[PDB]
Amino acid sequence: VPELKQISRVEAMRLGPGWSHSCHAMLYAANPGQLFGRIPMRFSVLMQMRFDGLLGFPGGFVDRRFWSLEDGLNRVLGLGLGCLRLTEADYLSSHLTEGPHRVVAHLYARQLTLEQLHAVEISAVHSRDHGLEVLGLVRVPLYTQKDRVGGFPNFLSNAFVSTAKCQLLFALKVLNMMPEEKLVEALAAATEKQKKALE
Amino acid sequence: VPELKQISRVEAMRLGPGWSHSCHAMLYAANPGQLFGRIPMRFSVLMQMRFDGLLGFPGGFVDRRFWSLEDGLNRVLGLGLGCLRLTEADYLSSHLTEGPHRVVAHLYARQLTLEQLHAVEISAVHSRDHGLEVLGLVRVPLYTQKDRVGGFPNFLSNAFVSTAKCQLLFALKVLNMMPEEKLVEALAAATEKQKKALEKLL
Amino acid sequence: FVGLRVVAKWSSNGYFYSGKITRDVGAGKYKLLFDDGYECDVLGKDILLCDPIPLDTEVTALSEDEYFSAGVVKGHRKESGELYYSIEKEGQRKWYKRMAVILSLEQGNRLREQYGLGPYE
């Protein structure tokens, strides 16, 4: 499992002006529904198709000169989702991106009810960024079908912002939503499918 | 360019019972907007993230024992989008899928206004199968950024049901939405990005 | 090594960035203050003792677009205490400030024999 280098929040705030800051939120909810009435869905996580054709989390770059990370995050979330006010209690981690540009990526996470998560989806389609920077929200399927690829492994075989794929696997692990061994196995099946596709 | 064997409509309707039929709809609209006040969007077309983690078009299998192609399509369109009913005048093509099963994939297309297209998006998030068989709608970015991968090439590097990727490329050509030369170079850029990504490991 | 200008990566597979050694942590470890303000402990295997980056070196030159591309160092100049690199890209040369000039993993690894600190286990 790929993992970015972590940095503490106070150390991230000491970075010089050459460092860009991004803030993204992983919104999720326990999901008691069953696909086809048969497949327990466990959880639903919100990601989005971005303007550049890649999957990522809601959020984006923030200006930290005169504002907290929370204010910048809520500003970008206001444009891309149209709702939600996140706080420091939702802060999860900070990672240095793989470069070559100097970017520190702050990850936020908040568990909603499924009804609240759906209300975020409804608000997102009326948002200012819809049809511009955000091309549509998608839910992450956390189940795996009997063919070992249907669902989560296939989803991981899509095209991600590299930071977002690391953040998704990191958050699913540390939030106790998926065992690490199952994340490794799903990622191995996804990489396998990507390998055979190019043949 | 991935090409499926095309077959005409009345030949598909005479295939034996060992053939499954699927009907999918490509909804699209002329887009006069500009991304970052610089990049023309030209067109917006609707695809969706499916339950199995792949990108595809709205639609699904049609059981011809009880439904016509149009009624079978409109059944799942009502579940996934709702506010839309297509007819045989919207029919576009029929292709025979790759291995191993015997499936004929029927493609429908309907040009909307961008406002009607957005209305479909608003309806889909309230639809019956949202969060179930359909995990969300996405707009296809047809532009390409200055770095030659951002936008359409990156989008083509996602995971599709193989029939849907062929139907998208086929329809963008015949509906005069993308010149074939730009479809080829986007596909080549997508393939090279997929190769570069897999060579970051180990 | 304390106080010497270096180019170093702060991850095993990352890019090499310009900075200075600030503390000898010991056991092949060093505390490094990068010119961008990031400070962390870096193994000597990740540190290159070359300043400035030598002529004809292949580097990665960052544009302020968030665009980046490979180039070749063709000159240096110090203007008002700031170092600038002349970087050639397919025949065209332009001036880049020091923090815009980095080394990819493969680019910097090729300098380890001439300028790398070590140890190399």
UniProtKB/Swiss-Prot annotation, chain B:
This is Tudor-interacting repair regulator protein. Belongs to the Nudix hydrolase family. TIRR subfamily. Its main location: nucleus. Changing K5E: Abolishes interaction with TP53BP1. There is a cross-link at K5, K146 (Glycyl lysine isopeptide (Lys-Gly) (interchain with G-Cter in ubiquitin)). Keywords: Isopeptide bond, Nucleus, RNA-binding, Ubl conjugation. The gene is NUDT16L1. It is found in: Nucleus. Residues 113-200 are annotated as: Interaction with PXN. Homodimer. Interacts with TP53BP1 (via the Tudor-like domain); interaction is abolished following DNA damage and TP53BP1 phosphorylation by ATM. Interacts (via the cytoplasmic part) with SDC4. Interacts with TGFB1I1 and PXN. GO terms for biological process: negative regulation of double-strand break repair via nonhomologous end joining. The keyword GTP-binding does not apply. One of its GO terms (cellular component) is nucleus. The record marks K5 as: Required for interaction with TP53BP1. Key regulator of TP53BP1 required to stabilize TP53BP1 and regulate its recruitment to chromatin. In absence of DNA damage, interacts with the tandem Tudor-like domain of TP53BP1, masking the region that binds histone H4 dimethylated at 'Lys-20' (H4K20me2), thereby preventing TP53BP1 recruitment to chromatin and maintaining TP53BP1 localization to the nucleus. It comes from the Eukaryota. It holds the Pfam family Nudt16-like. One of its GO terms (molecular function) is snoRNA binding.
Swiss-Prot record, chain C:
Residues 1-118 are annotated as: Tudor-like. There is a cross-link at K78 (Glycyl lysine isopeptide (Lys-Gly) (interchain with G-Cter in SUMO1)). It comes from the Eukaryota. Asymmetrically dimethylated on Arg residues by PRMT1. Methylation is required for DNA binding. Phosphorylated at basal level in the absence of DNA damage. Phosphorylated by ATM in response to DNA damage: phosphorylation at different sites promotes interaction with different set of proteins: phosphorylation at the N-terminus by ATM (residues from 6-178) promotes interaction with PAXIP1 and non-homologous end joining (NHEJ) of dysfunctional telomeres. Phosphorylation by ATM at residues that are located more C-terminus (residues 300-650) leads to promote interaction with RIF1. Interaction with RIF1 leads to disrupt interaction with NUDT16L1/TIRR. Changing Y17A: Reduces affinity for histone H4 that has been dimethylated at 'Lys-20'. Residues 10-38 are annotated as: Interaction with dimethylated histone H4. Signal peptide: none annotated. It is found in: Nucleus; Chromosome; Chromosome, Centromere, Kinetochore. There is a cross-link at K78 (Glycyl lysine isopeptide (Lys-Gly) (interchain with G-Cter in SUMO2)). It is linked to A chromosomal aberration involving TP53BP1 is found in a form of myeloproliferative disorder chronic with eosinophilia. Translocation t(5;15)(q33;q22) with PDGFRB creating a TP53BP1-PDGFRB fusion protein. Double-strand break (DSB) repair protein involved in response to DNA damage, telomere dynamics and class-switch recombination (CSR) during antibody genesis. Plays a key role in the repair of double-strand DNA breaks (DSBs) in response to DNA damage by promoting non-homologous end joining (NHEJ)-mediated repair of DSBs and specifically counteracting the function of the homologous recombination (HR) repair protein BRCA1. In response to DSBs, phosphorylation by ATM promotes interaction with RIF1 and dissociation from NUDT16L1/TIRR, leading to recruitment to DSBs sites. Homoligomer. Interacts with p53/TP53 (via the central domain). Interacts with DCLRE1C. Interacts with histone H2AX and this requires phosphorylation of H2AX on 'Ser-139'. Interacts with histone H4 that has been dimethylated at 'Lys-20' (H4K20me2). Has low affinity for histone H4 containing monomethylated 'Lys-20' (H4K20me1). Does not bind histone H4 containing unmethylated or trimethylated 'Lys-20' (H4K20me3). Has low affinity for histone H3 that has been dimethylated on 'Lys-79'. Has very low affinity for histone H3 that has been monomethylated on 'Lys-79' (in vitro). This is TP53-binding protein 1. It comes from Homo sapiens.
